[PDB]
Amino acid sequence: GSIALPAHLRLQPIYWSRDDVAQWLKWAENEFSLRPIDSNTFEMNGKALLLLTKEDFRYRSPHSGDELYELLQHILAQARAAFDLYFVLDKSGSVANNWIEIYNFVQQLAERFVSPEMRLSFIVFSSQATIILPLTGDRGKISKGLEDLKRVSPVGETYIHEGLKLANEQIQKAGGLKTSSIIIALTDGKLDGLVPSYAEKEAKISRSLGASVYAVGVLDFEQAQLERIADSKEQVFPVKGGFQALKGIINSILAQS
Ligand SMILES: [Cl-]
Ligand SMILES: [Cl-]
Ligand SMILES: [Mg+2]
């Protein structure tokens, strides 16, 4: 159910400009090996595009119209799905020179998930874990949540199982059917002592609650270590992957609905 939508394109198509519709068309054509689509085939914005019928799509693109209609529908269906995103953020001394890297990632990601049925929660952890921002879809509270993350000063050990625990406890209380709970751990992978075991054990609880566990490594990280925390190796993304990993995880999350 994956749609490799370009990063630029807003999550919701009703905000697409006339130029976004052209760019969607150019992308769809290379992504899906479609026959040449005239860039003048849909001369309208997203609002207008949502009013065309499938048969209109066929009139306008006899070769690819039905496919483009369904492609839109999937895009729209994932843009309206419910998501609980829980960011588990490493604040240990291992990442002191990389707090920049973690924060700008969390912010880029939060500024994309803006639909009314998307809530976010910010959790930090070092030796202990703390909830900076309780799960909420309130943009105003989320902004203060971001402003608090900027002042985080990284210190301590890497007790990542404490961080996942605070995600779990929130999911227990408001996790629901048709509410894809997602966990995004931004860490460096340097786990000492029993933390690897407790982490792999605690990520299973997340999977036992219906949540999907994504791992995002910062700077130089242990690839194998994260692979054991995330659901699959396909759910591990390097933060240094820039706009390319950032797109990848978005569409991976969106296709969880
Ligand atoms: Cl929309
Ligand atoms: Cl450490
Ligand atoms: Mg560390």
Author numbering: 1 to 257
From the paper:
(i) The long TELSAM polymers are expected to confer increased avidity to any weak crystal contacts made by fused target proteins, allowing crystallization of a greater fraction of proteins. (ii) The regular spacing of target proteins along the sixfold helical TELSAM polymer is expected to pre-programme much of the symmetry and spacing of the resulting crystal lattice.
We determined that the vWa domain could be flexibly fused to TELSAM with a linker consisting of a single alanine residue. Two molecules of the vWa domain separate adjacent TELSAM polymers, and there are no direct inter-TELSAM polymer contacts, a feature not previously observed in crystal structures of TELSAM–target protein fusions. The inter-vWa interface buries 491 Å2 of solvent-accessible surface area and is largely hydrophobic, with minimal polar interactions. Asn 104 additionally makes a hydrogen bond to the backbone amide nitrogen of Leu 194. In view of the fact that a flexibly fused target protein can find a rigid conformation relative to the TELSAM polymer by packing against the polymer, the rigid hydrophobic connection between vWa domains suggests that, while direct inter-polymer contacts are dispensable in forming well-diffracting crystals, a rigid transform between adjacent TELSAM polymers is still required.
